[PDB]
């Protein structure tokens, strides 16, 4: 769970997101794991919670792809190889020691307050 590069929290003031002990720059692979690629139907139902679905199907977050919560300024994201198989976690915008690593969602998965626009 804990790693010299980051740690899992379970934080003093955070839900279940990741903590960036670093120390990362713009474009740093913080971590990477495998995932599952299944179609909707019973899959989307039974796994209705931590499923990273793309425009074609719904996959599962094998590594720590689910723990990533939704933040207004996520300083870290992830990448996907050809399909929803290999999942990576880069650092969109350098991070400082003591930050929280998380990722956004997209059209689906709503956040809360529509305050992410300057228009």
């Amino acid at each position: 769970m804990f790693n010299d590069r980051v740690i899992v929290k379970k934080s003093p003031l955070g839900g279940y997101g990741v903590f960036a002990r670093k120390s990362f720059e713009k474009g740093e692979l913080v971590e990477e794991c495998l995932c599952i690629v299944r179609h909707n139907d019973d899959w989307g139902t039974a796994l209705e919670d931590y499923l990273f679905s793309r425009k074609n199907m719904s996959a599962m977050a094998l590594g720590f792809g689910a723990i990533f919560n939704h933040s207004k300024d996520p300083n870290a994201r992830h990448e996907l190889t050809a399909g929803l198989k290999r999942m990576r976690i880069f650092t969109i915008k350098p991070i400082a020691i003591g930050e929280e690593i998380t990722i956004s969602y997209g059209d689906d998965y709503w956040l809360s307050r529509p305050r992410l626009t300057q228009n």
């Binding site: 909707n40 989307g44 209705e48 499923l51 990273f52 679905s53 793309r54 425009k55 719904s58 977050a61 994201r77 992830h78 990448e79 996907l80 956004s104 969602y105 997209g106 059209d107 689906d108 998965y109």
Partner: peptide, 21 residues
């Protein structure tokens, strides 16, 4: 609510992607 509502949806996804709308 006083309007055309759509429960079912062919484009019903879950978590967006890194760069694939």
């Amino acid at each position: 609510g006083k309007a055309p509502r759509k429960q079912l949806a062919t484009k019903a996804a879950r978590k967006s992607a890194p760069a694939t709308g």
